[PDB]
């Protein structure tokens, strides 16, 4: 039995927008859950954020999570932006809503219930669980069954 919740996420997209997917692996309680789905039209950044959201929301009590992703998009926002995004009320310098604000808020709500430790691996030097992730991310994109609502060529 693992003392720490462990999450592995990945996201993929064939275009901009194009069919995309995500694969997340959750090591919770004594089980190992596997999430995966593809969306008909979307972006790689929305697929990479979806990975984490869908995984953190499977957790039904306050945990100590360790998250592993090679996503630079998430890294950058967690490391240099998000802090600033709350204080300003989720707005850009030109007073418009940040890109993917719908998912950043959704994720901010999920990150909120837990003790979160981030692990930024390099796309080519991670665990096999990151590889199984990319793999699912890929397969998903090759067969979309859902629609990414909050997607906008826009805002």
The helix/strand/coil state of 121 is coil
Catalytic site residue from 20, 38, 48, 129: 48
Environment class of 56 (CB within 10 Å of its CB; exposed 0-12, middle 13-18, buried 19+): buried
The tally of domains found in the chain comes to: 1
**Token representation of residue 37:** 């789905």
Residue carrying structure tokens 């909050």: 150
What is the Cα gyration radius of the chain?
A: 15
Q: Provide the CATH number for the domain around residue 1.
A: 3.30.420.10
Whether residue 70 lies in the annotated active site = yes
Whether residue 102 lies in the annotated active site = no
Determine the Cα–Cα distance for residues 135 and 52; give it in Å rounded to an integer. Answer: 16
57-48-97-85 Cα dihedral, nearest 10 degrees: 70
Determine the Cα–Cα distance for residues 139 and 129; give it in Å rounded to an integer. Answer: 15
- Residue 118: which domain range? 1-155
* 134 in a known ligand binding site: yes
- Note the resolution in Å, 1 decimal: 2.0
Chain mean position to CA 30:
23
| Best CA proximity match to 119, nearest among 2, 28, 5, 13 | 5
52-75-115-82 Cα dihedral, nearest 10 degrees: -100
Whether residue 124 lies in the annotated active site = yes
The answer to whether the Cα torsion of 120, 41, 82, 92 is positive or negative is positive
Residue carrying structure tokens 């199984």: 132
Catalytic site residue from 10, 102, 129, 148: 10
Determine the Cα–Cα distance for residues 118 and 12; give it in Å rounded to an integer. Answer: 20
Q: Which residues pair with 97 in a beta bridge?
A: 91
Determine the Cα–Cα distance for residues 153 and 117; give it in Å rounded to an integer. Answer: 33
Whether residue 108 lies in the annotated active site = no
3 state SS for 135-149: HHHHHHHCCCCECCC
């Amino acid at each position: 039995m693992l003392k720490q919740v462990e999450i592995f996420t990945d996201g993929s997209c064939l275009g901009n927008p194009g069919p995309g997917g995500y694969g997340a692996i959750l090591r919770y309680r004594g089980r190992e859950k596997t999430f995966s789905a593809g969306y008909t039209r979307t972006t790689n950044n929305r697929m990479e954020l979806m990975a984490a959201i869908v995984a953190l929301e499977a957790l039904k009590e306050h945990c100590e999570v360790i998250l592993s992703t090679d996503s630079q998009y998430v890294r950058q926002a967690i490391t240099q932006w998000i802090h600033n995004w709350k204080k300003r009320g989720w707005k850009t310098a030109d007073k418009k809503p940040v890109k993917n604000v719908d998912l950043w808020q959704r994720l901010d709500a999920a990150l909120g219930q837990h003790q979160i430790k981030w692990e930024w691996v390099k796309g080519h030097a991670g665990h096999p669980e990151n590889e199984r992730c990319d793999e699912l991310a890929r397969a998903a994109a090759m067969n979309p069954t859902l629609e990414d609502t909050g997607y906008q060529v826009e805002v």
